[PDB]
Write a protein that binds this ligand. Structure first.
Ligand SMILES: O=S(=O)(O)c1ccc2cc(N=C3C=CCC=C3)ccc2c1
Ligand SMILES: O=S(=O)(O)c1ccc2cc(N=C3C=CCC=C3)ccc2c1
Ligand SMILES: [Ca+2]
Ligand SMILES: [Ca+2]
Ligand SMILES: [Zn+2]
Ligand SMILES: [Zn+2]
Lengths: 96, 96
């Protein structure tokens, strides 16, 4: 009875919870695994452009420098991926 | 060949573009239609709790007060919906 958009939001929370530790936050090796497992085509587009997105993603998104990615910082990471796909839809190259 | 997570991000951009005007932004009646069409179960949970989420969503999310919701403000709206589902998964009531 949920719509495609509601299922996508619910699945986003469930995806976060595949990778969290017991403090409900994602550490660095688990964040890189999450990216490889869930955004491999995005990552491959970046590599084609000469960008290794995994070299700096944790440092860029761990905004409070606690060495963990909490749910708010995870939303910001999904917002960056979504913003790259929105620029592509307007004719930008991937991973711009 | 895209994963479920990549399909969800792509579908999010496509959903934004169902509702934009020619300036790539969503006006107020189209934002309310988008919510009714895409998040009806979320909305129904809010109504059960006595909250009419559509009364104030535009005013809360139009952060630069230009009377349009641009892609950045649309991501913030999806982040609020996702944060409510993340609190529910931790045992909060819906639409808290
Ligand atoms: O046709 S599919 O490629 O299988 C597809 C997948 C997910 C979608 C998410 C959509 N909406 C979202 C809402 C909130 C967060 C992410 C996507 C809309 C359409 C979608 C379509
Ligand atoms: O089994 S389903 O209910 O049909 C489903 C639907 C969408 C998902 C999105 C997922 N990941 C997302 C990534 C980015 C933005 C939104 C969701 C993960 C699992 C999902 C599962
Ligand atoms: Ca952090
Ligand atoms: Ca605005
Ligand atoms: Zn959690
Ligand atoms: Zn656009």
């Amino acid at each position: 009875s949920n719509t495609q958009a509601e299922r996508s939001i619910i699945g986003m929370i469930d995806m976060f919870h595949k990778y969290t530790r017991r403090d409900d936050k994602i550490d660095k090796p688990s964040l890189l695994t999450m990216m490889k497992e869930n955004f491999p085509n995005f990552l491959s587009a970046c590599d084609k452009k000469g960008t290794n997105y995994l070299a700096d993603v944790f440092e860029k998104k761990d905004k409070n420098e606690d060495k963990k990615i909490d749910f708010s910082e995870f939303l910001s990471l999904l917002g960056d991926i979504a913003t790259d796909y929105h620029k592509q839809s307007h004719g930008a190259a991937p991973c711009s």
